[PDB]
Write a protein that binds this ligand. Structure first.
Ligand SMILES: Oc1c(Cl)cc(Cl)cc1Cl
Ligand SMILES: Oc1c(Cl)cc(Cl)cc1Cl
Lengths: 219, 219
């Protein structure tokens, strides 16, 4: 039996750093108003098979796009996302703009996700195919790290538009279209069928389904 | 064995997400001007022994504070850091003040570092000791994630002052002293003695030793 109003359960959500930054603030009001002793922990993605973390209960929900989670896994598709490019407000390419070749000759920072089997790996692969190897100056596993490096140096960064907009709304980056075609991605929450009937998991699942991920955090 | 002006070597630096965000932008000018094909990859901290990653050449340099790195390891202490608290400018306790009692009754997000054996674990331990368990609403392994969440919710975040001051520029955090006695920490670069004589490693270490970590990134 799980009662949100009195529980002190610590829920663990596996997600990229941006996924955590997107999710947790949108849980705050719900926690404050209805589950004041419930704790939520964001857990970084690891190389091991995520399905086993979900099966054992060491992760309650995975939040992201995880193409290799299937067998033994239930899902709810939360939203669809598209990629854009960002550069800092004082980037010298802004004076005359970029055609596709000038883009390829700029310096880039890449977020790598193939080691975590996160759907961003599809974009990573396309960028690695597109770009001259010497054009790639930085690599990182974390989205927020790459965004703040783009604010402080002349590197181009290709990222989900929700992440881009968060920084653009604060003044630090400007957004422009990716000059090649990239897939859109589906972001979902995932749980193991072993916990499909668990009252705590069900509660968190349903809370997440109520979240508006295109809007500011409530309250 | 190594010439920076022509090298296409990919150096891997292990660090917290803030450490990566601190380090890489401060390498950019050096790379642009003296080593245009050298790539730098920020690598997240992991639960396994970091000494083995340095030993195997899997990581070139570790950057941060790692109290369990010793046998087989050479270090250079780069700077000392102290902690502060941040809260968003629209947080209620802003006016009241942040006395210890009011601090304890606020909601907190804690950056957990003990699993990575990073020196922030010392501050983590002090907070967990003083705060009631119901005061801790969120946990994350990522400093930048926690800063985004503090910017967007009424949680209090206790962090290195260099992260706080820089992060408070955009968006709107207010910095407070922590009403707890906290140690300062030493930030160092770490390498394995096996690569003490590797010319590529030597070059990168000396570049790092010339960085002003108290100043903005060059350019
Ligand atoms: O991991 C992600 C999540 Cl959960 C959401 C978005 Cl929009 C992007 C990423 Cl990379
Ligand atoms: O990992 C860190 C580094 Cl490398 C530098 C500072 Cl100032 C703080 C942290 Cl948490």
């Amino acid at each position: 039996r799980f009662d949100p109003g009195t529980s002190n359960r610590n829920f663990r959500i596996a997600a990229s750093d941006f996924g955590q930054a997107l999710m947790l603030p949108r849980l705050y009001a719900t926690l404050e108003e209805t589950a004041p002793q419930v704790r939520v922990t964001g857990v970084n993605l690891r190389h091991g098979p995520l399905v086993e973390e979900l099966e054992s209960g060491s992760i309650d929900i995975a939040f992201g796009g995880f193409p290799t989670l299937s067998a033994g896994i239930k899902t709810q598709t939360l939203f669809r996302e598209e990629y854009v490019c960002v550069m800092r407000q004082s980037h010298p390419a802004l004076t005359h703009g970029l055609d596709l070749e000038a883009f390829r000759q700029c310096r880039h920072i890449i977020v790598t996700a193939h080691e975590f089997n996160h759907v961003h790996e599809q974009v990573e692969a396309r960028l690695l195919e597109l770009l001259p190897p010497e054009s790639i100056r930085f690599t990182t596993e974390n989205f927020l790290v790459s965004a703040v490096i783009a604010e402080e140096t002349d590197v181009i960064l290709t990222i989900p538009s929700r992440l881009a907009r968060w920084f653009a709304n604060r003044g630090g980056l400007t957004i422009f279209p990716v000059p090649i075609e990239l897939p859109s991605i589906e972001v979902k929450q995932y749980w193991h069928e072993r916990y499909d009937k668990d009252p705590g998991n069900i509660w968190l699942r349903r809370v997440i389904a109520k979240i508006g991920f295109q809007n500011p955090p409530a309250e």
